[PDB]
């Protein structure tokens, strides 16, 4: 129907939201395959990305895709997919599935003192 | 900057303008810390007076190794042609 505005300032209307979400979700899965399988970030993000990708592949309509992705406008769903891709690329470098780097001191989180 | 003798005389002129150094004990090979009895910051403001006179910035790694007027005139000779 070619939505005129997203309503959010600085968030332009995406012309082809379905193909853009398919590209972003397969790119998230490609980046996310470089994480070990036992990492919870990989399991959880593959789970939610496969759910969103199946919803995108199942719905031709743009408005109904917005109501069942449940993330607002379709352009901020695209923006969140970009943020998840950037996050996964950072999580490869951080490697935060590793064990805890240091225990806190024994009364560090004791409240009240 | 032309001859080494003029650079040495100008180094000694800068050091005799510096009021904490005794001009009677001020020689070319006199050490600042253990002979002339100076603080490190005294040597730092000596090096800044040398930068004022000779017109080039002396970095920190090669100003810490300037502990006598002979080292100063050799450093100014090495950063120029002479």
């Amino acid at each position: 129907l070619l939505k005129k505005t997203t309503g959010l300032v600085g968030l332009a209307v995406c012309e082809t939201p379905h193909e853009r979400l398919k590209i972003l979700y397969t790119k998230i899965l490609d980046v996310l395959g470089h994480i070990p399988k036992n990492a919870a970030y990989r399991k959880y993000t593959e789970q939610i990305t496969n759910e969103k990708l199946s919803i995108v592949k199942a719905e031709p309509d743009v408005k109904k895709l917005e109501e069942q992705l449940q993330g607002g406008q379709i352009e901020e769903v695209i923006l969140q997919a970009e943020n998840e891709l950037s996050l996964a690329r950072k999580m490869i470098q951080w490697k935060p599935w590793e064990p805890l780097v240091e225990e806190p001191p024994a009364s560090q989180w004791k409240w009240p003192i | 900057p032309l001859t080494l003798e003029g650079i040495k005389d100008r180094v000694l002129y800068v050091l005799k303008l510096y009021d904490k150094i005794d001009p009677e004990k001020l020689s070319v090979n006199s050490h600042f810390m253990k002979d002339l009895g100076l603080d490190s910051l005294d040597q730092v403001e000596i090096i800044m007076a040398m930068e004022d006179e000779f017109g080039f910035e002396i970095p920190d790694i090669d100003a810490e190794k300037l502990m006598c007027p002979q080292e100063i005139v050799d450093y100014i000779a090495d950063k120029k042609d002479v």
Binding site: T5, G7, L8, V9, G10, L11, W111, P112 | -
Partner: protein
């Protein structure tokens, strides 16, 4: 090279790097009203700490009272009585009218439109009469307290609030006749201070500073407090993120505050106005002078104060300047261990440097107007 203007000492110091007419850098120097409020709070009881909140956003007194009261009541695990909650929502929207009159009319006064200032401050004087009739003070009421409110409404106050509210929309209409369609007012606000939605979220903006950019967020709707889920109102949403849509959002919030005030006047319940836990709220003076337990509780609440159970909350309200938060840490004693005050104007004035890039020097006073900045809450 480029010009550096030190606009010296609300009160604000500004360090401008200008490149002719354009603004290259805006560095707001603050602390000119830093009074160390939240260090003073650590040496006072919770009741004693309450009147500091009147003096942070000093055009939004009972709203900051409400935010601090909600924080203390959350840590105390008690709730105010329903009539207290309706009085808090009524006076919170009267307070919102006070603050948006102050915001819009001083923002017009700093641009050059000096007359609707004088027109709307008589209405503001009548609302200060409402504060004075309910508490005894025109501005710093110390009225909304942890446990409810201090004192019940005097007889005949709601009729006068009705007589104010019945006429106030015409005052908004003639303000809007002076400014909204005026081409001089539009030339000072329409392309000025454009904030994208993502930058407004990232820079910690709240309130109209989000809603002018099209972000559908209002804490009275999304994270509702006292009885705001029982009142019906709309949330004005901007479309261009500029000074003009934020102006229109504040005008329409005055409209919706009048709507909420009508609903509060019609739905005011009977009953008590303090929580009937006399280990938190002081008993009535007639039973203080008659009952032994009531006299003991009066004594201890006005000397020691109530003990608050240990823990930390972040309690936020939709104040008329945006999200007003208290991060309150209790150690178990009757005095706050820590009270961080989150003010909207702090992050808004931090975003002033991005908002002023590419604009003129006369646009900066408009951007400092559209960010409703009171330096009491900015500096604490």
């Amino acid at each position: 090279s480029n010009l550096t203007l030190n606009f010296g000492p609300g009160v604000l110091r500004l360090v401008m790097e200008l490149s002719g007419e354009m603004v290259r850098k805006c560095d707001p120097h603050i602390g000119l009203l830093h009074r160390g409020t939240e260090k003073l709070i650590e040496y006072k009881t919770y009741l004693q700490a309450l009147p500091y909140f009147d003096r942070l956003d000093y055009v939004s007194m009972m709203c900051n009272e409400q935010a601090y009261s909600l924080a203390v009541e959350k840590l105390l695990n008690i709730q105010p009585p329903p009539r207290a909650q309706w009085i808090r929502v009524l006076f919170g929207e009267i307070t919102r009218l006070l603050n948006h009159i102050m915001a819009v009319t001083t923002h017009a006064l700093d641009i050059g439109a000096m007359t609707p200032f004088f027109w709307m401050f008589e209405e503001r004087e009548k609302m200060f009469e409402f504060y004075e009739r309910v508490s005894g003070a025109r501005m710093h009421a110390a009225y909304v307290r942890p446990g409810g409110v201090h004192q019940d409404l005097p007889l005949g106050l709601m009729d006068d609030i009705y007589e104010f509210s019945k006429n106030f929309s015409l005052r908004i209409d003639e303000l809007e006749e002076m400014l909204t369609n005026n081409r001089i007012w539009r030339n000072r606000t329409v392309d000025i201070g454009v904030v994208t939605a993502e930058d407004a979220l990232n820079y910690g903006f709240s309130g109209v500073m989000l809603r002018g950019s099209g972000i559908q967020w209002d804490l009275r709707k999304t994270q509702p407090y006292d009885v705001y889920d029982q009142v019906e109102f709309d949330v004005p949403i901007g479309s261009r993120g500029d000074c003009y849509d934020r102006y229109l959002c504040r005008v329409e919030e005055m409209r919706q505050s009048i709507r909420i005030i009508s609903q509060c006047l019609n739905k005011m319940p009977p009953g008590e106005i303090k929580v009937d836990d006399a280990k938190v709220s002081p008993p009535k003076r007639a039973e203080m002078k008659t009952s032994m337990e009531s006299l003991i509780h009066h004594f201890k609440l006005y000397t020691e104060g109530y003990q608050v159970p240990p823990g930390a909350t972040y309690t936020a309200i939709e104040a008329p300047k945006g999200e007003f938060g208290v991060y309150l840490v209790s150690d178990g004693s009757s005095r706050p261990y820590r009270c961080k005050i989150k003010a909207p104007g702090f992050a808004h004035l931090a975003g002033l440097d991005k908002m002023s890039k590419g604009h003129m020097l006369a646009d900066v006073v408009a951007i400092i107007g559209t960010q409703d900045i009171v330096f009491g809450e900015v500096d604490r």
